Structures are given as C-alpha cells and as structure tokens.
Amino acid sequence: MCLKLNLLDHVFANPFMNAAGVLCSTEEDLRCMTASSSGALVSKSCTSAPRDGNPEPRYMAFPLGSINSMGLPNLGFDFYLKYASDLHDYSKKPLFLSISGLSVEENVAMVRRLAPVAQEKGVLLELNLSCPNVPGKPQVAYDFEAMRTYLQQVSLAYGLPFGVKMPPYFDIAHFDTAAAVLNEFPLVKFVTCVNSVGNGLVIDAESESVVIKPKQGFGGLGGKYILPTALANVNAFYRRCPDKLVFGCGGVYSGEDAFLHILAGASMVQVGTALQEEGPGIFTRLEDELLEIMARKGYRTLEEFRGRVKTIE
Amino acid sequence: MCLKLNLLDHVFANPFMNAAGVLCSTEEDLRCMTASSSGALVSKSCTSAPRDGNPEPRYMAFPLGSINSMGLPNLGFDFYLKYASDLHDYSKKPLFLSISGLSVEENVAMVRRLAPVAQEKGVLLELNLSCPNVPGKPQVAYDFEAMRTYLQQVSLAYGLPFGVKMPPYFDIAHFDTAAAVLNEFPLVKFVTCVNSVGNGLVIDAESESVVIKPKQGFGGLGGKYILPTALANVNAFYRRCPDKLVFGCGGVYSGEDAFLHILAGASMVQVGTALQEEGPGIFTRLEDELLEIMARKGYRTLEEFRGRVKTIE
Numbered sequence: 001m002c003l004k005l006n007l008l009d010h011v012f013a014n015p016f017m018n019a020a021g022v023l024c025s026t027e028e029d030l031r032c033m034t035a036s037s038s039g040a041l042v043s044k045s046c047t048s049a050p051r052d053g054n055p056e057p058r059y060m061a062f063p064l065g066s067i068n069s070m071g072l073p074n075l076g077f078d079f080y081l082k083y084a085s086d087l088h089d090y091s092k093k094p095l096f097l098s099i100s101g102l103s104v105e106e107n108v109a110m111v112r113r114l115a116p117v118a119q120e121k122g123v124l125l126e127l128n129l130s131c132p133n134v135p136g137k138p139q140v141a142y143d144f145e146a147m148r149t150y151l152q153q154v155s156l157a158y159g160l161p162f163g164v165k166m167p168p169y170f171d172i173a174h175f176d177t178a179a180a181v182l183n184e185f186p187l188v189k190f191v192t193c194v195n196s197v198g199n200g201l202v203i204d205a206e207s208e209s210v211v212i213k214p215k216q217g218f219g220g221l222g223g224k225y226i227l228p229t230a231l232a233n234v235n236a237f238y239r240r241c242p243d244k245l246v247f248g249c250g251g252v253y254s255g256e257d258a259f260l261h262i263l264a265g266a267s268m269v270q271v272g273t274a275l276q277e278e279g280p281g282i283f284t285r286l287e288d289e290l291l292e293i294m295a296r297k298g299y300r301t302l303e304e305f306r307g308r309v310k311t312i313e
Numbered sequence: 314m315c316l317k318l319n320l321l322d323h324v325f326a327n328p329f330m331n332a333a334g335v336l337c338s339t340e341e342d343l344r345c346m347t348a349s350s351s352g353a354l355v356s357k358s359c360t361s362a363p364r365d366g367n368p369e370p371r372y373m374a375f376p377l378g379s380i381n382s383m384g385l386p387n388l389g390f391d392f393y394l395k396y397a398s399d400l401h402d403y404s405k406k407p408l409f410l411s412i413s414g415l416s417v418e419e420n421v422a423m424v425r426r427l428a429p430v431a432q433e434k435g436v437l438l439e440l441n442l443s444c445p446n447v448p449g450k451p452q453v454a455y456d457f458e459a460m461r462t463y464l465q466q467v468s469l470a471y472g473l474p475f476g477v478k479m480p481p482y483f484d485i486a487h488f489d490t491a492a493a494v495l496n497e498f499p500l501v502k503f504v505t506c507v508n509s510v511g512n513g514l515v516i517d518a519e520s521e522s523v524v525i526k527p528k529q530g531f532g533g534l535g536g537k538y539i540l541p542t543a544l545a546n547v548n549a550f551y552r553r554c555p556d557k558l559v560f561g562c563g564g565v566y567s568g569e570d571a572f573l574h575i576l577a578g579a580s581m582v583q584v585g586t587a588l589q590e591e592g593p594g595i596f597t598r599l600e601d602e603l604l605e606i607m608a609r610k611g612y613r614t615l616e617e618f619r620g621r622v623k624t625i626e
C-alpha cells in the first residue's frame with residue numbers, strides 16, 4: 001500500500017511533515033528534513049530580521065512531552081526565502097514557509113516578497129498567529145478583531161492560497177467565533193491545529209526549580225500532554241470549515257496517533273516534540289505504523305476514514 | 314514533620330481534599346470523604362434545582378487522565394445546604410460547599426441562603442466560575458465582564474469570605490486580566506486553580522469512536538494531561554494575588570505532584586481524576602508520600618516551601 005495524496009495542487013508521498021520550529025531552522029536542518037521520508041517540510045517561523053531568541057535553557061523534554069520558550073530564534077526571512085527560491089529540491093517534496101512577524105506590517109512586507117516565489121516555485125505559506133507576550137493585549141488568535149485584521153491584510157498583500165497556524169481553543173463559543181473569522185477569507189485554504197498549549201509550567205521536584213530560563217519557567221507544551229486538545233481542535237475546525245483543509249499537529253508519537261488525527265479530520269499530520277526527541281527516522285516508523293493499522297482495518301486510502309470519527313447516538 | 318495548615322479560620326490536618334465533582338454528590342459520598350484521611354472535603358457543584366445531568370457515558374478514564382461532560386448532575390442546593398447545616402460533622406474536618414448556578418441570579422439566590430449557615434457552622438463557599446452562562450458565549454471566567462458581574466453580585470449577596478474555582482488560562486494576558494478582576498473583590502479569599510482543561514476530544518482507535526456521548530465526544534480533561542497547565546495557573550495566581558490563598562487542583566496522583574503544587578504556591582491541594590480512579594485510600598498514600606519528600610529535604614512544615622519554586626537567573 002502507499003500513502004500518497006494531493007492537496008493544495010501539490011502531490012505528497014504521505015501525510016507526515018515536521019511541525020514548524022522542529023528540525024527546520026538552518027540550511028542543515030532543512031536539508032535533513034528534505035532527505036527524510038516525510039511527505040513535506042515546513043521552515044522555522046521567521047521574522048524580517050534574524051533573531052537569537054531567548055536565553056538557554058529554553059526547551060526541555062520529558063516522558064509526557066515538552067515545554068519551550070524559544071523566543072522565535074531564526075535566521076531571518078531573507079534566508080528562508082533564498083532557501084525556497086534557490087536551494088530546495090521541489091522534486092523531493094513540497095515546502096511550506098512559516099512566517100511570524102511581530103506586527104501586521106511585518107507580515108505584509110514578507111508575504112509581498114514571497115508571492116512571486118510561491119507562483120514560480122510552488123512554496124506554500126503557513127502564517128503563524130502566535131507571538132511573544134505584549135503586556136496589555138492577548139495573543140493575536142485570542143483577539144478576534146486583531147486576527148481578522150491580520151488575515152485581511154495578508155490576504156490582500158499575498159493574493160494566493162495560504163494557511164494559518166492556530167493556537168488551541170478550549171471553549172465552544174471560541175471555536176464558533178474563530179471559525180467564522182477564518183471562513184471570511186477564502187484564500188485561507190488550510191488551518192493547522194494546534195500550536196503548543198500556551199504557558200504551562202514544568203517544575204523539577206529534586207531541584208525545586210523550573211526547567212526553562214525564560215518567562216520564569218512558563219512555556220508552550222507539546223507532546224502527549226496535548227493530544228486530546230489537538231484532536232478536539234482538529235475536529236472542531238474540520239466540522240466548521242468545510243471548504244478548508246485542516247492539518248493536525250499535537251501529540252503524534254505513533255501511527256495510531258496519526259490515525260486519530262486523520263479520523264478527526266486531518267489532511268496532513270505534523271510532528272513536533274516526538275521528532276525533536278527521536279529524530280527524522282521517526283517518519284519511516286510512523287508511515288509503517290499507519291499503514292499497518294489501515295491494513296488491519298481494511299482501509300486502502302486515507303479518504304476512506306478522514307473525518308469519519310464516530311459519535312455516540 | 315507536619316502537614317497541618319491553619320487558614321480561613323479553620324484547621325486542617327493536611328492539605329488534601331477531593332476536587333469538586335468527585336466523590337461528593339450523595340450523602341453516602343460525603344460521609345465517605347469525611348471518613349477518609351483527607352484534610353477537607355468539598356460538595357458537588359450544585360444548582361437551585363436537582364439535575365440528572367447528561368446522558369451516559371459521560372465520564373471516561375485512561376492512563377493519562379480523564380474526560381467528562383457530566384452536565385452538572387447534583388441533588389440540588391437544598392440537599393447540600395442541609396448536609397452543611399445538619400449532617401456534616403465539623404469535628405472531623407472542614408467542609409466546602411461548591412455552587413455553580415446557571416445564571417447570576419441563581420447564584421445570588423443560593424448564596425443568600427448559604428450565608429447564615431456559613432456564619433453559624435463555618436461551611437466555606439467555593440463559587441464555580443468555570444461553567445456555562447448563555448449558550449454561544451464563553452464560560453463565565455472566560456468572559457471577564459461576566460466574571461466581574463458575578464463577583465460583584467455574589468460579594469453583595471453573601472457578605473462573607475469565599476473562594477472561586479477557575480478554569481485554566483493559556484495566555485499571560487488572561488492571567489493578568491483575570492487576576493486583576495479577582496483582586497477587585499476583597500471577600501474572594503481563595504482561588505482554586507484549575508478546573509478541567511475544556512473541550513478536549515478523546516478518540517478510541519479500535520472503535521474509531523469518541524468515548525463520551527454528550528457534545529459529540531468533547532469534554533473537560535483532567536489528570537496527567539493537565540499537571541503543567543495546573544502548576545502554571547497556580548503559580549500565575551500566586552504571584553498576582555498576594556492577598557489571597559491559592560488552592561491547587563489538577564494532575565495530582567502522588568505526593569510528589571502535591572509537592573510541586575505547593576512549591577508553585579498551593580495551600581490546599583485537591584484531587585479529582587486520581588481519586589475517582591483509586592478511591593479514598595489515595596489520601597493516606599499522598600500523605601505518606603509527601604512526608605517522605607519533606608523528610609528527604611529536611612522540610613518540617615508546608616510553609617517552609619510553599620510558593621518557593623526557584624526560577625533560573
């Protein structure tokens with residue numbers, strides 16, 4: 001059996017890719033993801049200028065998952081654009097570029113430059129709504145008027161199909177409001193659910209200490225902690241955005257976990273913490289595992305079960 | 314070495330108690346919690362009228378935690394008021410009564426009648442703000458104007474010290490706003506962080522099905538999934554509300570997990586999922602485990618380490 005699929009006018013060998021931020025910051029990292037058996041790759045979220053990010057330690061992993069406050073360390077937009085425009089081998093797999101400007105104007109400036117490269121090479125845009133804390137106002141995707149502005153301005157500046165990386169929501173009225181915003185924008189063709197579960201706190205009992213330096217130890221959670229949160233957001237948006245694709249991200253360690261994301265509605269499945277921990281060999285294992293669960297069930301395609309999670313009565 | 318605490322004008326043998334909703338709905342449950350080694354108990358969140366709650370299955374547990382959409386099944390306010398006024402033996406341990414009216418008026422009506430019993434018998438109010446108000450609006454504690462209204466009205470109607478049960482928040486801006494609202498109300502003497510992580514989705518791979526019947530399988534998450542989120546909220550509020558107590562709730566299965574809560578700032582420590590799963594014998598184990606960590610570290614009292622989590626530089 002093979003796991004090959006088409007979307008967004010691209011062909012993918014399988015639905016797996018890295019999550020933005022993991023194994024994708026340097027040319028080395030991008031070449032390593034390209035060499036992997038993933039179906040696609042996404043670059044590190046970038047800003048107009050390079051950033052060193054926050055002080056170390058800024059990432060830690062544990063049996064149940066990870067916590068991070070990286071601070072958007074990246075080599076700057078010119079680097080990632082050059083990678084997309086000159087260095088990436090599109091014959092190997094599709095590329096998505098993640099942008100995370102600190103204002104609307106910065107995002108507009110980047111997407112205007114990306115548009116012709118998207119037209120000529122087929123690089124895909126993932127717009128990351130998460131950002132550093134600004135005292136006195138919420139994260140963009142938790143401020144629905146700010147979100148609507150970002151999407152209206154990016155849509156106008158870019159003019160081509162793109163996606164948006166969302167933080168998790170926890171309230172059905174928030175799902176309803178966020179999806180209504182997203183559905184105002186026909187160029188938003190995919191929604192990736194989810195970014196890390198914001199501002200957790202991991203404490204080491206022995207040392208009586210937080211485990212990351214920035215933000216007094218507060219950082220985004222990934223991994224096993226967040227799988228049911230991720231599945232709920234994937235499904236909520238799959239149900240609310242029938243003209244869009246949903247990409248699942250959060251808590252994938254196994255083909256089974258990927259299977260659940262796809263049942264919930266995921267088209268592509270992104271792997272963050274488990275990729276950081278296991279390395280790019282994980283992609284062959286996830287493919288093998290997903291194909292085994294399909295075989296056991298009699299499914300020959302992903303479309304035969306995508307979004308088909310069953311409810312009770 | 315000593316687990317005693319003396320707060321809110323009561324004395325507690327140890328900081329452990331059930332989380333509202335677990336082992337606290339019937340007189341049988343309340344007598345069981347009173348018989349246990351817990352330092353306190355809290356009754357099931359109640360409404361003016363008795364409620365049957367949602368259809369079953371509405372709770373499920375797994376290795377990493379639980380999901381529920383119970384729908385506020387309870388025996389009605391009058392039952393819990395009678396338990397507090399006439400049945401509970403206050404010589405065993407202190408009692409908290411949790412109230413979760415479906416409108417501000419409902420809460421005002423209950424607290425008016427609870428007041429004289431609170432004054433005479435010393436039952437302590439926990440007001441649940443992580444609950445529905447109007448369908449299509451967020452839960453109360455996610456709607457800061459509604460939250461302010463509920464607290465103004467309850468403070469005026471009740472007129473005695475009380476506490477509040479908060480959902481988890483995920484954005485620093487929400488910690489900031491939420492704590493600022495709470496600090497407007499001097500009668501709010503304790504803040505219990507956290508209720509369940511809202512609207513997750515657990516899917517069973519073999520059956521391809523959600524595991525709870527209400528809300529298309531969406532429900533609040535408890536247990537191992539939510540410990541870092543719980544710690545973050547306990548510490549966030551600990552830092553922002555220096556004139557209030559913080560009670561920790563979420564992901565406690567062991568004396569080590571309780572130790573982390575207390576380092577974060579917790580006074581009382583509540584136990585939901587793990588208590589549901591293990592039963593009331595858990596309290597002896599948690600006591601023993603916490604005392605063993607204290608002994609190893611040379612801590613004689615809880616106040617020697619409460620709130621003393623270390624940050625890095």
Ligand SMILES: Cc1cc2nc3c(=O)[nH]c(=O)nc-3n(C[C@H](O)[C@H](O)[C@H](O)COP(=O)(O)O)c2cc1C
Pocket residue numbers: 019020021022044045059066068070072098128165194195196221222223224226249250251252270271272273274276
């Ligand atoms: C070290 C690290 C860096 C990340 N950087 C980004 C990023 O630059 N942009 C982004 O959209 N998400 C970023 N994330 C979030 C992940 O893409 C992903 O949404 C999250 O980790 C949840 O997936 P997981 O459970 O597989 O880890 C980062 C995650 C980690 C652990």
Ligand SMILES: Cc1cc2nc3c(=O)[nH]c(=O)nc-3n(C[C@H](O)[C@H](O)[C@H](O)COP(=O)(O)O)c2cc1C
Pocket residue numbers: 332333334335357358372379381383385411413441478507508509534535536537539562563564565583584585586587589
């Ligand atoms: C079956 C069930 C019933 C619950 N009912 C209530 C409730 O009536 N009021 C309330 O404040 N919280 C309720 N909760 C939330 C718990 O009090 C607790 O905040 C949550 O489960 C997190 O703690 P844990 O990780 O120890 O489970 C309920 C939890 C469960 C599992």
Ligand SMILES: O=C(O)c1ccc(CCc2c(C(=O)O)[nH]c(=O)[nH]c2=O)cc1
Pocket residue numbers: 021045054068069070071072073100128130131132133195196220
């Ligand atoms: O708190 C910060 O300093 C902060 C928070 C989020 C971001 C956006 C980039 C990002 C990061 C990161 O670079 O810290 N980590 C994630 O889990 N998700 C992300 O989207 C960037 C910075």
Ligand SMILES: O=C(O)c1ccc(CCc2c(C(=O)O)[nH]c(=O)[nH]c2=O)cc1
Pocket residue numbers: 334358381382383384385386413441443444445508509533
């Ligand atoms: O979705 C609902 O119908 C809903 C959500 C929350 C409540 C309040 C009672 C409650 C419940 C409950 O009875 O479902 N479960 C929790 O995990 N925490 C709670 O505070 C009650 C009902």
